[PDB]
Design a protein around this ligand. Structure first.
Ligand SMILES: [Zn+2]
Ligand SMILES: [Zn+2]
Length: 66
């Protein structure tokens, strides 16, 4: 009877549908958002920076590998 459920690092709640593995954790596909505007990537692409998510523009606005 070992555990068997991811937990959204956003609300620390047991996820149960589609999980997002980021920050070396798990996030509700609905709570995984940019770390600057909070825009969830339900079905979009996200960007990571310093260990934090960022939209395509905020990530870049924040850095953009440049
Ligand atoms: Zn969550
Ligand atoms: Zn953003």
């Amino acid at each position: 009877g070992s555990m068997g459920v991811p937990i959204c690092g956003a609300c620390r709640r047991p996820i149960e549908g589609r999980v997002v593995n980021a920050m070396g954790k798990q996030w509700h596909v609905e709570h995984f958002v940019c770390a600057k505007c909070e825009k969830p990537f339900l079905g979009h692409r996200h960007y990571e920076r310093k260990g934090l998510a960022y939209c395509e523009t905020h990530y870049n606005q924040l850095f953009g590998d440049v």
